[PDB]
C-alpha cells in the first residue's frame, strides 16, 4: 500500500540561526578550549601538555 | 472519608526554580538561596523569586524610567532591576547612578559609565548590599505589550477597547457591520 504520511521533499531540512547568536556560540566555545578541566571532560588526553 | 477538596493539596502552581539552563543564572540562584536562608531579609526574598521569573514577567526598563525613578535619590542608593536596562535617545541628561541588572545593552552600559555610574551584576550587589540596604527595587512595565492589548473583554462587546486579530489594516479589514451605525450596529 501507501505509507501513512509519505515523506515529501519540502520538509524543513535547513535551520536558520541569527548571525549574532552564532558568533556568541563560537566565542563561548572558544573560551571553553582554554580551561583544561573542560578539555579533559571531553576525553582529550592532555596530561603532558605544557 | 474526610470532606476536603482535592484531598487538601495545593492546586495553585508557582515557580521554585528558573526554567532556563544558564549556568551563571544557576549560580546566582544558589547564592541567593543561601542569603534568604541565613539573613532572613525581605529584599533578598523578592530577588530570589524574580530570578525564577520568565522573560515576559521581567520586562525591560529604559533609561527614561530609571533616571526619573532615581531622580534625587541617586547618592547612597543602588537601583536594582531583575531584567534588562535598555537605552533611551529621548533624554539628554543622565545622572550618575549605581545600577544592578541581569543584562545591560551596550548603549545603556556606555550611557551609565560615561555619566559616572556603575553597572553591577547581582553577585556584586550581594557584596555591597547583602541585605539590600539603601537600594531601590524597580520593575519594568508588565502590561506594555502588544499581546496584552488583545487581552481582556472581546473586541465585539460594549465598552471594550481590545485589539482584534486582523491580518491587515485598512478600510476593508473589519470596519463595517459592528463598527458603525450605518452598517447594522456599533458594539
Amino acid at each position: 500500500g501507501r505509507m501513512f504520511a509519505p515523506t515529501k521533499t519540502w520538509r524543513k531540512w535547513h535551520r536558520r540561526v541569527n548571525v549574532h547568536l552564532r558568533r556568541v556560540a563560537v566565542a563561548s566555545a572558544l573560551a571553553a578550549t582554554s580551561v583544561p578541566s573542560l578539555v579533559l571532560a571531553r576525553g582529550h588526553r592532555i596530561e603532558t601538555v605544557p | 472519608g474526610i470532606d476536603l477538596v482535592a484531598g487538601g493539596r495545593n492546586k495553585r502552581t508557582k515557580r521554585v526554580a528558573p526554567k532556563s539552563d544558564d549556568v551563571y543564572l544557576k549560580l546566582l540562584v544558589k547564592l541567593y538561596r543561601f542569603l534568604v536562608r541565613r539573613t532572613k531579609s525581605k529584599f533578598n526574598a523578592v530577588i530570589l523569586k524574580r530570578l525564577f521569573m520568565s522573560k515576559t514577567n521581567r520586562p525591560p526598563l529604559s533609561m527614561r524610567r530609571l533616571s526619573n525613578f532615581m531622580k534625587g535619590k541617586e547618592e547612597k542608593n543602588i537601583a536594582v532591576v531583575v531584567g534588562t536596562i535598555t537605552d533611551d535617545m529621548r533624554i539628554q541628561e543622565v545622572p550618575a547612578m549605581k545600577v544592578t541588572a541581569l543584562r545591560f545593552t551596550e548603549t545603556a552600559r556606555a550611557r551609565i559609565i560615561n555619566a559616572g555610574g556603575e553597572c553591577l551584576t547581582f553577585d556584586q550587589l550581594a557584596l555591597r548590599a547583602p541585605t539590600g540596604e539603601n537600594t531601590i527595587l524597580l520593575r519594568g512595565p508588565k502590561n506594555a505589550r502588544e499581546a496584552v492589548r488583545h487581552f481582556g473583554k472581546a473586541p465585539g462587546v460594549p465598552h471594550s477597547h481590545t485589539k482584534p486579530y486582523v491580518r491587515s489594516k485598512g478600510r476593508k479589514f473589519e470596519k463595517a457591520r459592528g463598527r458603525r451605525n450605518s452598517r447594522g450596529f456599533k458594539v
Binding site: 571553553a32 580551561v35 571531553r42 605544557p50 | -
Partner: protein, 135 residues
C-alpha cells in the same frame, strides 16, 4: 574559571562519569578519574571540578596533590610523592599533606580510608588471599 562553574558544566555528562540503569530511582553513578578518592560523581569528590585534589593510587603507594598556581600548566600541576614505608608512616604523611596543611581537610578521612584499601590491596598482591572476609 572557578570550581563551582566547572562543576555545573561537567555535572550532566562527562568522559569519566559512568551512569547505569537509566534515570529512575535505579540510577547508579560513579566516576572513573584519578584524584577522586571514592569514585563518586559529586562536587566534593570530583577530580575535575576542584582546584585542590588528592590522589591515592598504587604504583609502594603514590600520593598526588595538585598545585593551585599551576592550573594553566598541566605538566607541572601534580606534585607527586611515592612512599614505600610502613602503613602508619604512610598514614602520617597523608595526614600531613592533606589535613595539617589545611589542603582540603574535608578529604582527610576519605584519603586515609583509600590508603587503607590500596595498601591492603597491595598486601594480598604479593601474598595471595588466604582468608575470606565474610564475618
Amino acid at each position: 574559571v572557578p570550581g563551582s562553574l566547572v562543576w555545573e558544566l561537567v555535572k550532566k555528562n562527562n568522559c569519566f562519569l559512568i551512569k547505569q540503569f537509566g534515570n529512575s530511582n535505579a540510577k547508579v553513578q560513579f566516576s572513573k578519574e584519578p584524584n577522586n578518592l571514592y569514585n563518586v560523581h559529586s562536587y566534593k569528590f570530583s577530580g575535575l571540578a576542584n582546584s585542590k585534589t588528592v590522589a591515592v593510587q598504587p604504583s609502594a603507594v603514590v600520593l598526588s596533590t595538585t598545585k593551585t598556581k599551576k592550573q594553566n600548566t598541566p605538566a607541572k600541576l601534580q606534585h607527586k610523592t611515592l612512599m614505600r614505608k610502613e602503613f602508619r608512616k604512610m598514614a602520617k604523611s597523608v595526614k600531613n599533606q592533606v589535613c595539617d596543611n589545611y589542603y582540603r581537610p574535608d578529604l582527610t578521612k576519605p584519603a586515609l580510608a583509600r590508603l587503607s584499601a590500596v595498601y591492603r590491596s597491595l598486601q594480598v598482591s604479593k601474598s595471595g588471599i588466604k582468608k575470606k572476609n565474610r564475618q
